[PDB]
Amino acid sequence: DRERRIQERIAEKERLAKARRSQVIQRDLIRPSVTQPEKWKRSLELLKEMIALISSDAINYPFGNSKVKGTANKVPDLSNEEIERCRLLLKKEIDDYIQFEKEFLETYSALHNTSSLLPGLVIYEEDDEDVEAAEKFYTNDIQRDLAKKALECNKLENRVYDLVRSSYEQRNFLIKKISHAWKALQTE
Amino acid sequence: MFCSISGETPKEPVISRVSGNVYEKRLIEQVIRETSKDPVTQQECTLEDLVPVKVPDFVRPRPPSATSLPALLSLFQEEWDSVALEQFELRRNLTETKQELSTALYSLDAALRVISRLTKERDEAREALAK
């Protein structure tokens, strides 16, 4: 009697938990990184300084295990009915032909931005730097290259051991068999 | 003849009974070997779902002048450079779409906060007008 409903009440808590659902970490794909506080002071002109708090809220989840810089948690929390109402507010006012024009516009303009440049110069199309952007990004690329070379050479040793065990025999047997037997069959 | 897979002209176009779309037999067979399901409809797909078809072949550019012909390496270098550039732009697209998603989240949050402000201020103004 008790647990047939008590465990159901626990499932009720998990059913109340589905209503409360943030984003960004809901699908947990990447994140606004760690060096948060500097970007907010660096912000020019308006909503760039407001995204500060949500980025500071992103350190509450274990993503901060990647790194921590400044922290400065200012979580304002939210509500389920709050989220739903403004989802209505957004999608009531925002008809497919403009979206076709949008997709054409964004794709081209991207292709214009996405030039044949190894480092990202779209911001540098307005800024003035090419050599140092060529330096830091692809010295990090070299460092990851070295790390990958190391973790592969750790696995080369067992391959070359198995291979002096197998392909060395294969090549020796191959040469000794093929050359001698084949040049003897013709003579016979 | 506009192949939806890369844009290159397909020398062996195929048709599908459930949803006819331009692919190549070898690639779809290999994908079904990897995962025997329809990629678009998320339904089981078998090896007998494709019907044989005939194709008229194409021409080749056949580069002449036979001078030590080492240009293959340069074309290879260009191919890896292109794929590396495309990977970088994958990274940029992911970063920009996530930044836009976050910006949208706080924009809608600010809309809620400012609408609370609006309703409270309008109630205050109308009540003082009644007073």
Add this chain to the structure above:
Amino acid sequence: MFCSISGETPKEPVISRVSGNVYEKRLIEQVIRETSKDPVTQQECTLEDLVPVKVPDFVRPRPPSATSLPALLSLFQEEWDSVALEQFELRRNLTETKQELSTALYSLDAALRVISRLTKERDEAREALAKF
């Protein structure tokens, strides 16, 4: 390396002309003597239709590895189709990301216009409050 008639490996393998299969000499000659038919594909077969092995020949073989030019060119095109398949998957991901990016783009532009209009309303309401 397996004979369908008996299930055992053929000591002296022989290939049937009518239907490609690997038999052993004794059983294949038995089934040829009893009738002129293929035990598998039930089609006419004869003694001449059986092909013994003529492996020895006179030419110089190669190692069966990636060290010959047909084999090496096979590995060439394998590398090429591997990087090609990588490009295929990443271009699918690129177009999906472009679609969702465009959706977020018009959503955010509409949201910014909504924010501007709302803040205009709130400045109006603040003026109305301050009117007293």
Add this chain to the structure above:
Amino acid sequence: LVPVKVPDFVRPRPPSATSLPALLSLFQEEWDSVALEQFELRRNLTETK
């Protein structure tokens, strides 16, 4: 010709054959090797005749 069934010859890769300029070095090496085989066989023609 009749397409017959074979288990196919497995092609085991050397210690270092993983794309990379190893593959282009092998391109040049097998070029040279088959060409030198051709030279040896042609001069063998001339000497034998």
Add this chain to the structure above:
Amino acid sequence: VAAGKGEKLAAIDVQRYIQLKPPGTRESLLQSAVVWEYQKSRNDNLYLLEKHGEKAFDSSLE
């Protein structure tokens, strides 16, 4: 090519992808990117090799 290499004359192609040129012009970027792509392909090929082990080698010897 035969009239060329009749005196050996080993044909030359660029193997300067291990020198790992320090920070310089765009050539450094190109070498780093191509080396990264070579490394990824090498990873894939060698892990694929060790998925099955040396059963193929045993079959070749047999």
